[PDB]
Amino acid sequence: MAYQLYRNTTLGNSLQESLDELIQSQQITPQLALQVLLQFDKAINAALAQRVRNRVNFRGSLNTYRFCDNVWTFVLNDVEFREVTELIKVDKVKIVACD
Amino acid sequence: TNYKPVANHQYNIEYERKKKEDGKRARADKQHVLDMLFSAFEKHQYYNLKDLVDITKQPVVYLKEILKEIGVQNVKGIHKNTWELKPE
Amino acid sequence: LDLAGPLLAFLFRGMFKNLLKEVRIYAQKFIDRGKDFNLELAIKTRIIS
Amino acid sequence: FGVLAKIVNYMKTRHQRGDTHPLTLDEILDETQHLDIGLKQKQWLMTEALVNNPKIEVIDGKYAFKPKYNVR
Amino acid sequence: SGIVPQLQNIVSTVNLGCKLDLKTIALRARNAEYNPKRFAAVIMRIREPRTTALIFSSGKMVCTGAKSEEQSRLAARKYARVVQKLGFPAKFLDFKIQNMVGSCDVKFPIRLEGLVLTHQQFSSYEPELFPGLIYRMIKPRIVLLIFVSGKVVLTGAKVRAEIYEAFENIYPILKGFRK
Amino acid sequence: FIQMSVQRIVEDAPPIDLQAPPRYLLKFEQIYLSKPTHWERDGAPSPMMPNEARLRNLTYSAPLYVDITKTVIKEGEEQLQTQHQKT
Amino acid sequence: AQLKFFEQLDQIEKQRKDEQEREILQLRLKQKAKEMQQQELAQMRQRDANLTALAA
Amino acid sequence: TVPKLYRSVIEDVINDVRDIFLDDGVDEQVLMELKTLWENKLMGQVEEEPLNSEDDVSDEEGQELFDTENVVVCQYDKIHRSKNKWKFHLKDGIMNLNGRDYIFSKAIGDAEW
């Protein structure tokens, strides 16, 4: 019942691995694990929407892009993420966007 | 100052902007449309096509095709002949 | 004795009732369509004139 | 109960396959991506209520032969 | 005349002869985008020909942006090959150049007012709607956008011969209205 | 008639209520009347003398204008009030 | 397990004691109506998660 | 900073899953065990039908298969492109650059194709 964007990240992967361990131990049912994932998606969406109040900038070049079902899958190279406080350099990046 | 020349009326441009931003309703897959229709019928026994189109968010022609496949039009003596989402 | 004034007042009351009637109809169509309505376009001057 | 009418639509497409065979509810629920818990029990109460009016024939044993007229 | 129009964009349609899955093409293609709410086709872009192609589920495709006929044909073939590599039985059937656009400069200002007065039957000059005069040539079915700066843009041509013939026809007329 | 009755009729005319959700209210407040005027084919207004009206078969009429306040309640807890002067 | 059966009977009274308030009186009905609206958006919102996982 | 936001997210997640754990009838110790393990884990061709006349007209498709490089997942408000450049109003989201995570609200991007 949620976008589930952040599942394929460090946080979502750690949560999924923990749920897998409990499933292996029979402590939790897979339906409960799925419910936990859904609730996590809701909570993380709300938390990023509310408690984040910082702007970022970035520049670079684009090598590929895709769009389907309101899902952008940009693929940039030699990106420079510039922020007023710090600057980060990356050789390649994949930007997945949804709405 | 009345009827001052204008390229386009403010209400007209606002409505056109709303239409463009919303975009035309897309033709979704038959399985998903059918599931949404069955869910709607659970909430209400009888549905009018105009409101069912709003609920499903699908093109009128495509929705009418899918609804002709399963549901059936019943003539009523109270308001008008309307669709019935029960396949039988 | 109904002079020019009262007679014209009667006619004008009738025509203003009309004017508001067409104003209501024109605005109601746009409101039903969901779009705002232009007051100047809603008015028919030929009614009174 | 809506999922139940969806199962009816599923077995209708199953007729459309022409490979109609005596079945049961668990395999359909699996192939339609749905589980087997007490929810299946309440929906099976609804399903037996259906078996009281299954114009789309759903008998308990060897079954599912909907069409009142059916030869090929 | 000493001036030859240079093509700025070519439109060509070709039928692949097989139905396609727009969602699958959008998901698997490199530069393709698919917004059924906005448009019913799939818009793809290839940089090396520097062109854009719209692909429909009916199997027909439209290629635009090609500066030359050879470039247009090669780009259409490349798009068809991409769709084929995506596993579909895409082919190259009835490729045709539907429209060609060319541009040029006459290198002198033009009196569009005199031009429209002389050729009202073919001319249409409405500064309110568009500053450029629209001329509808009959013998070639070409539409020319003539501008006071001297720039001339021809459109509606199916072959480069039509573009060149239309410019050859119009140049003597424009020379008579040199400013 | 011109000074009292026209203005009083406009005032006594009930406010127009529309709703079909946002609702609009139209109220006619004030009457304005200019001197008798004639518009040429080019659209330029000019005062119309009675002798000119007699000779040219015109109607000795004065333009009539009303101040109209339109208030829209969108149900969003804000109402927008716009006044059209001398419609 | 017998105690779990008793807890299930108590959950039925939550709704069943409440059901007597229904008919006599609609908040529960409103909540149910709202729930269906959440499900409609979910399926659309969910569709994105499966494809985004494939994309990334 | 980011760890503190993570702890707040932990609090929100546990609070949000308490009601589901009551609904499904499962004991509450599951949440404690889940949090413990989660924290531990974290820290002239006239016959034109044949298309084989051209080859190597593509690029390596293994980038999307790998996805091992840095990944940014966010939401987009406006995305415009004018014939060369792609412009990005990406709103609040998350970024995974060199393992370290970044959090942002407004992201502005310009890229060339």
UniProtKB/TrEMBL annotation, chain C:
Domain of life: Eukaryota
Subcellular localization(s) per the UniProt record: Nucleus
Function of the molecule: RNA-dependent RNA polymerase that catalyzes the extension of a non-coding RNA (ncRNA) at the 3'-end using the four ribonucleoside triphosphates as substrates. An internal ncRNA sequence near the 3'-end serves as a template in a single-round Pol II-mediated RNA polymerization reaction. May decrease the stability of ncRNAs that repress Pol II-mediated gene transcription. DNA-dependent RNA polymerase catalyzes the transcription of DNA into RNA using the four ribonucleoside triphosphates as substrates.
Family named by the database record: Belongs to the RNA polymerase beta chain family.
Protein name per its UniProtKB record: DNA-directed RNA polymerase subunit beta
Residues of the full protein shown: 470 to 518 of 1251
